[PDB]
Write a protein that binds this ligand. Structure first.
Ligand SMILES: CC(C)C[C@H](NC(=O)[C@H](Cc1ccccc1)NC(=O)c1cnccn1)B(O)O
Ligand SMILES: CC(C)C[C@H](NC(=O)[C@H](Cc1ccccc1)NC(=O)c1cnccn1)B(O)O
Ligand SMILES: CC(C)C[C@H](NC(=O)[C@H](Cc1ccccc1)NC(=O)c1cnccn1)B(O)O
Ligand SMILES: CC(C)C[C@H](NC(=O)[C@H](Cc1ccccc1)NC(=O)c1cnccn1)B(O)O
Ligand SMILES: CC(C)C[C@H](NC(=O)[C@H](Cc1ccccc1)NC(=O)c1cnccn1)B(O)O
Ligand SMILES: CC(C)C[C@H](NC(=O)[C@H](Cc1ccccc1)NC(=O)c1cnccn1)B(O)O
Ligand SMILES: CC(C)C[C@H](NC(=O)[C@H](Cc1ccccc1)NC(=O)c1cnccn1)B(O)O
Ligand SMILES: CC(C)C[C@H](NC(=O)[C@H](Cc1ccccc1)NC(=O)c1cnccn1)B(O)O
Ligand SMILES: CC(C)C[C@H](NC(=O)[C@H](Cc1ccccc1)NC(=O)c1cnccn1)B(O)O
Lengths: 178, 180, 180, 180, 180, 178, 178, 178, 178
């Protein structure tokens, strides 16, 4: 393809895109690209550009674990939109290397899901929703440097950020302007 | 008209899936037979597959409200909400036909409901108090410990009428009258 | 016919999803029972899942308009608009069955409505004054501060009838009458 | 039957979506109540979401045709065409319940209609004279300049009944007869 | 029942989309009112969006057949076939409400009909004699040259009732009778 | 493909097309192409030809940020249609290098969206719609040089421009005629 | 593919096909091919063969602007069908180089569209439909050499042409017969 | 692909297939193949094998014009089925080079279509259906050598031919038997 | 493709992904990759990264048998999610080489299925469901080192694990943290 050819040429320049919703297919190819780029050269930065409406928690936790366990520093770039798992992986970049492009908008909100089945199933989904929500808020409190009480309070409904508001809040470390 | 002659002889026929509209009909019928003769026993025939918890507790509270004793008779099936309504009859007047099936199981969301996790902690706290209320109701009427019913309604517990008598859902398995 | 005998004994039965057609039936019934005897209390039975704000405030204003006191009785459910109609009864006459559920939650758009941002600033100002009117209505009838109700109806607030009495939605949890 | 007793007391109940069949019912009812007593006021209850311009101007012309004064009462909603029918009542007799909503907005094509540009210059000239006729009608009945209404119905203009009185849509916000 | 009292006062209400079943009802009603009193004028109320040419010419021929004069009154819309039925009233008795819309346009195939070109030369010769018959009918009743109507019904020609009077579709725009 | 082959050969000549609605997929491949062309040669102009009915704000803000942060001058070309985000990215080109082909039509209008959910969700969507609409109008006022009051007044409904009207208004800098 | 391979080999011989409805996808690849062929050699003719039921006005105006601003002479060929935008781009060829194959049929008709939305939206769509219809008729009057009053009169309904009738009317300049 | 690879290898041997319904996509690639083969060698025959249920008139008129204006002799081969536009393009081959394989069946019938829209639209479609039907019958009378009165009489309903009946009627010139 | 190209380059580095639901298509290509990598070099470890919501028992038993009968040590990696068959194949790795990335979540639950048909069919499906459930619990008791009574008790409903809980329970052998 052409779109795959341009992404392949940026993969040679160690630039990978999270440009869709974070489902398991886009997460596995990003985890594959991070493992491929960390094996190719383990000292150069990987530039991950986020244009994402967010997606699955476990898909983004796969990316986040692959970002952390890579010996490379994953530079993240809020490119237009970093909503949900997109803001998470944005803020999951290497400290000092989390960037927002100046008109990117960062959406922060508690995870969405769905309860189904019997009341014993839903009681276990609810226990696990409380575990996921506590862990997502703990990591956003670790990324942004905000207290977990403020992360939980702001991620009650949708909490939108501009690039300057995300810089003050702690998702990104710089707003690049050239 | 055979449903009128049931109702003229004070027999409320449940019959269908317990939903809002089925619950609305029975509460209309439980209170009219309450007003016609509050000292004469209302009979409730149950052949329902259940469903609905607020429709359950609409029928349940109304048949507990009325002055008349409710004679619950299970015909071929009392599942979910209907087995609770079957136990909701007055003690000594809870009946079942010999090949009727009593199916007790914990409340369940039919289909996924979406939402934020704060929305889903409340929909899960709701079905948890739907579950405890189903077990507290079924413990008042079966004489069990309500943790026993939680162990028993963990899965679908199909009761034959002879072992719904031993469970306490019904009080009498109906003997046949064929004069033959 | 059991719905006729409810209405002949001045009982309006809400029963279904509050939409336009359900609101149109009740306002037709609230005014006829107003004209039959304006000094005798209309009873409103509520087993509704709610829905509709203009259908809510059509039923709400009409049951506030009529000379007759409205006795609201929650049967198994008063979710969304129906819990506002449940509080809309006259003080001292707001009743609920013991296992009835009262569900209060802020107004919500069922499904996305598209449009320009100038169109959506007005549809959002509409649901904001739908929200304040739901809270101002529910503060006149529960005796709360309307910012307390905004904190409480932030999510789905399921009230048991005993704690809908403490909330002020109803005034009396109905005791049972079974001769027993 | 509560809709019959409204109509026997000369109350036409709009209630539903203004389409052809809803317009056909009201014009049948406006002329029968014209023939029963042309000097006694017809009351028109409006809980409609609107819709239809030829169905609007069928109801509009008929309620302007009849000898009887039309008392328009908005119940919970008068949107689009129904708010024009709400203003179409006789002056001094246009009423609204306190939490009723009046929604005035310019005419709109529900869905795309295809065609050649000569076909679409006529369908656009039609909705333009639908727009001017909606504004000329609503200026006769609100006392505004019809360019003011064009500025106001540029978007959806939701009016509360107290500010539909100030706008001229209604003449009286209805006071209650139970003080709660 | 308001449609019965229209028909008892010799008013046929068109109301809906002119199709077969709507045409079948009116011809049943045109001939009964012909048999009840052939010297007393049948009134035909038209709020139709039109449609159908054989259903048009079924209603058209029957209202031309009967001994009674047909008073056609356009309520909010007399489109396509219905505008031809509106002109089909007797001269001097063709009425329209002031904001009624008269829409005349040439016949059209709703949807594509397939076939061989010999099949389509006949379906095109059919809609051509549907077109000439629509124009020859509308020239007998408007007093135009039938080539003028071909130029005018080339596209959708929306007529206001005041300019459907000038066109010859109707004879009188109805004045209002609100005693005020 | 052939269509991808012709676009690849114009990518070699530093000509990229915005030829669809601006969704996240077309935005990410344009952002990839701008990053690929700015890394290939950081001094030659990138010709971005707009034939677009517009699209997502955040997708177009991703393109706009990639256009600005590229060291290349992004020459934009209204090719037939620049509507919604298409006129935005047209007017987002380098000043002096925003072109309209002589029969391109530029559609300018306030952003479209959708409110959904609870009244606390919709109140936050409305706050964010007011932020997006203010920022879109601020940038169109920066691009065209018009006052933001005129941008807000003209982008109330659809506001169509010919190539000559867009030249007077300020979306493009030239109408090329050869 | 094979179909893409045959089109690629004719693109090497500077023969491009408008063979579908003129939507934005087919227009952008034709505009890409005209820009690619004018950059490859700016003096050889580009043969554009039209087999088209017509399509979008703005898509065809993108092609028409790319045909005019190309330094090449775009020879157009009515190949079977040139309807709507297909006759427009046929007649938009270089004068002297607009050809009809002898059994091509040219359909000329006013533009089709759709009005939707509120009455203020539709009033602006109608103003813009009057602008598009005036501009389409002005260019067909420029192409064919007919008066704009005759273009407007003939493009009221469908107006069909044979190759000989289109030669007399002015859409094509020759009917090639070999 | 494989199917495209076998067709590409027969395109090298100047054998092209009309093997589908004649729509604009199959017509444009055949017109592309005839233009490609006539440009590759303008003196060798092109073998067009027809296995077609027929299709669009204007699509087949595009092929027929490309067959005639090619300097090559288009040898046509009824391969199984030449119904509708398939018999037309079969009989449109070079005289002496129109072949039927011995169990091909040739279906001849007047064109099918559809009338829609207003009565002024349908009256123009009917005038154009009479033009297309007269021109299709004129060319079948030219191809087969039959009178146009017999062509019109036989193409009233479906008129089926075997290979021997099509040889007597004039669609093909030989029935090859090896 | 690009996604297939990155997976091919990790297949060269002996890194394969279970990144979807375990159906027969994903199982056969993993079994093909394990057979291909064990034939390529029979002494180097194969890194199988699990990001899976689980899937078919027999598909995962195909993978598990291919993992065991490979002479290579299959290092497994819980990458985000190992649910159902994904936790099974995670715990099916070589002892000492079963890894959880630090925010992977492991879902353990009894198998799901469906009974259908007559009562003699369903009685045989139930016998086979008891065989599959006993064998799945026996192998999870072998993998984790837990008693089969605890495996059966915990896999009654959904039993979620963090990476640290899965390390204590026995699904993984290490939580890699770099
Ligand atoms: C990511 C955090 C910040 C909040 C949001 N997360 C979610 O809503 C997503 C919803 C989703 C998305 C795509 C596919 C499947 C499920 N959360 C989850 O993946 C999820 C939901 N319930 C349990 C475990 N994980 B965001 O992605 O919309
Ligand atoms: C045993 C008693 C509590 C009734 C049982 N409860 C339920 O699962 C049914 C489920 C249902 C049925 C029909 C339509 C919608 C939902 N009752 C409920 O309404 C319900 C709703 N949410 C959670 C739990 N139960 B049974 O399944 O009917
Ligand atoms: C007390 C009430 C107001 C709380 C809840 N209200 C709502 O969510 C209802 C549900 C609904 C119904 C029809 C269309 C869209 C949404 N909201 C509305 O009535 C509504 C209607 N139009 C616009 C905005 N909200 B409940 O569903 O009644
Ligand atoms: C304010 C008065 C004029 C009525 C308004 N006009 C219209 O848009 C309605 C259309 C409608 C709307 C909602 C549901 C069904 C039909 N009136 C019409 O019939 C109509 C038809 N063409 C253009 C404009 N309006 B309103 O939208 O009902
Ligand atoms: C002005 C008079 C002639 C009525 C007009 N006539 C028509 O356009 C109607 C619309 C229609 C209805 C049903 C099926 C197909 C088409 N034309 C016909 O009745 C019709 C029916 N069959 C073939 C051709 N035309 B109007 O559109 O209702
Ligand atoms: C460029 C602006 C000024 C004009 C138009 N913008 C939009 O409508 C775009 C297109 C769109 C995409 C998805 C859903 C709804 C709308 N709006 C947005 O992207 C959008 C909508 N709501 C919130 C944030 N962004 B155009 O691009 O369609
Ligand atoms: C070329 C003109 C004169 C006649 C016809 N034009 C149109 O109907 C086309 C409709 C179309 C076709 C395909 C895809 C999208 C839109 N015109 C337009 O593109 C159009 C329509 N309304 C406003 C602006 N442009 B033809 O192309 O079908
Ligand atoms: C070849 C002739 C004599 C017979 C048949 N051809 C046609 O008439 C074809 C069949 C067809 C194909 C595609 C879409 C619609 C219709 N018709 C046309 O192309 C057609 C129809 N009406 C006007 C102009 N052309 B055959 O090819 O099916
Ligand atoms: C893997 C074990 C631990 C638990 C779950 N297993 C299953 O549900 C899987 C998924 C599945 C596939 C097709 C049809 C039904 C179910 N079950 C089976 O593969 C399966 C095997 N034999 C009989 C019935 N189901 B998991 O994969 O969701």
């Amino acid at each position: 393809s052409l779109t795959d050819s341009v992404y392949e040429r940026l993969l040679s320049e160690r630039i990978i895109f999270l440009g869709s919703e974070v489902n398991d297919e886009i997460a596995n190819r990003l985890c594959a690209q991070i493992l491929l780029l960390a094996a190719e050269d383990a000292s150069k930065d990987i530039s991950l550009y986020i244009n994402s409406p967010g997606g699955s928690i476990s898909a983004g936790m796969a990316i986040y674990d692959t970002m952390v366990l890579a010996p490379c520093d994953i530079a993240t770039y809020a490119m237009g939109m970093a909503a949900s798992m997109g803001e998470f992986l944005l803020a999951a970049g290497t400290k000092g290397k989390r960037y927002a492009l100046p008109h990117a908008r960062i959406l922060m909100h508690q995870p969405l899901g769905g309860v189904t089945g019997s009341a014993a199933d839903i009681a276990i989904q609810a226990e696990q929703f409380a575990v996921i929500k506590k862990e997502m808020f703990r990591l956003n409190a670790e990324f942004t440097g905000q207290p977990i009480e403020r992360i939980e309070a702001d991620s009650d409904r949708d909490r939108w950020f501009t690039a300057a508001e995300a810089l003050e809040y702690g998702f990104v470390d710089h707003i690049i302007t050239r | 008209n055979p449903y009128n002659k049931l109702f003229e002889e004070r027999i409320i026929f449940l019959g269908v899936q317990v939903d809002d509209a089925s619950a609305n009909d029975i509460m209309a019928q439980l209170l009219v037979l309450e007003s016609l003769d509050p000292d004469r026993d209302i009979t409730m025939y149950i052949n329902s597959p259940g469903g609905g918890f607020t429709s359950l507790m609409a029928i349940y509270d109304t048949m507990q409200y009325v002055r008349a004793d409710i004679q619950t008779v299970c015909l071929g099936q009392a599942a979910s909400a209907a087995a609770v309504l079957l136990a909701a009859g007055t003690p000594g007047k809870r009946m079942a036909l010999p090949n009727a099936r009593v199916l007790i199981h914990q409340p369940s969301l039919s289909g996924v409901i979406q939402g934020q996790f704060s929305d889903l902690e409340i929909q899960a706290a709701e079905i948890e108090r739907m579950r405890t209320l189903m077990e507290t109701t079924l413990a008042r009427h079966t004489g069990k410990d309500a943790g026993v019913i939680r162990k028993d309604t963990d899965r679908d517990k199909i009761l034959t009428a002879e072992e719904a008598k031993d469970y306490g859902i019904i009080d009498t398995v109906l003997e046949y009258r064929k004069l033959s």
